């Protein structure tokens, strides 16, 4: 995260770290949506241009964390993966359309002060809150600048951007399964996700029921925190039917 700040303890208890077993390293963020399901970006698991195609046994998820590098004894919980599910129409060839994956854990995780699931949006919450100018929150352990790494989880609040501005910022084909967020050059304030943050959550706190909802998944950007560029997020609500089908079947 660029131009963010240190998270408070327990500020994002749904935040998950995707961790490679060997070599041991951070791969991506992710989020806890129930005691046995974790949501991330499909490109964190499958990206053939980079020879990336992880299997369950290659990976662990670490839940309840604050420090990036420490083993947080008696606080974090480490879970093995039972099964990975990637959206069948994830478009890794062109633009990361439908950049979403689910990971089922081998055993349920126990909730705690540090471990608690985020809500997924219903149609009405999405329609009400996914409006230009409305801010969400992005969290992660990724790099602090494009060209460096944080001691603890970072957090930044960013406004959703008007769809024409998102489209006019890039040559990539933008789809209805994406939204973009970030400040404009004239707004002064700054901030963005960066390498290592992808797959983590873009959340909003509903003013109707005072619950946190995951509206986006950190998906892609061109650089980090560049003027006139914006970060792109998977539109979680638009893909809810697939999420539900997976959880119902499996």
């Amino acid at each position: 995260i660029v131009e963010g700040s240190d998270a408070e303890i327990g500020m994002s208890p749904w935040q998950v770290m995707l961790f490679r077993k060997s070599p041991q390293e951070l791969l991506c963020g992710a989020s806890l949506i129930s005691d046995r399901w974790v949501l991330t970006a499909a490109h964190c698991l499958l990206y053939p241009p980079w020879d990336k195609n992880f299997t369950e046994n290659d990976l662990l998820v670490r839940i309840g964390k604050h420090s990036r590098t420490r083993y947080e004894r008696n606080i974090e919980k480490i879970s093995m993966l039972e099964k990975i599910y990637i959206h069948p129409r994830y478009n890794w060839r062109e633009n990361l359309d439908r950049d979403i994956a689910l990971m089922k854990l081998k055993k349920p995780v126990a909730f705690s002060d540090y471990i608690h699931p985020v809500c997924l949006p219903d149609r009405e919450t999405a329609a009400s809150l996914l409006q230009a100018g409305y801010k969400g929150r992005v969290t992660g352990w990724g790099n602090l600048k494009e060209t460096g790494q944080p001691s603890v989880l970072q957090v930044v609040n960013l406004p959703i951007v008007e769809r024409p501005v998102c489209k006019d910022s890039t040559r990539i084909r933008i789809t209805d399964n994406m939204f973009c967020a970030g400040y404009k050059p004239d707004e002064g304030k700054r901030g963005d996700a960066c390498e290592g943050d992808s797959g983590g959550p873009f959340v909003m706190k509903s003013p109707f029921n005072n619950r946190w909802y995951q509206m986006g998944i950190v998906s892609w950007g061109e650089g980090c925190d560049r003027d006139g560029k914006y970060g792109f997020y998977t539109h979680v609500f638009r893909l809810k039917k697939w999420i539900q089908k997976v959880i119902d079947q499996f």
Binding site: C119, Y134, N210
Partner: peptide, 28 residues
């Protein structure tokens, strides 16, 4: 799911984090 999105160290105690008000103020 019934308890989703309510943080033990914040909403469940009626404590606010340092920047959530920035989000609320944007929901015009």
């Amino acid at each position: 799911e019934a308890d989703c999105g309510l943080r033990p160290l914040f909403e469940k105690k009626s404590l606010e984090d340092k920047t959530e008000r920035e989000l609320l103020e944007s929901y015009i």
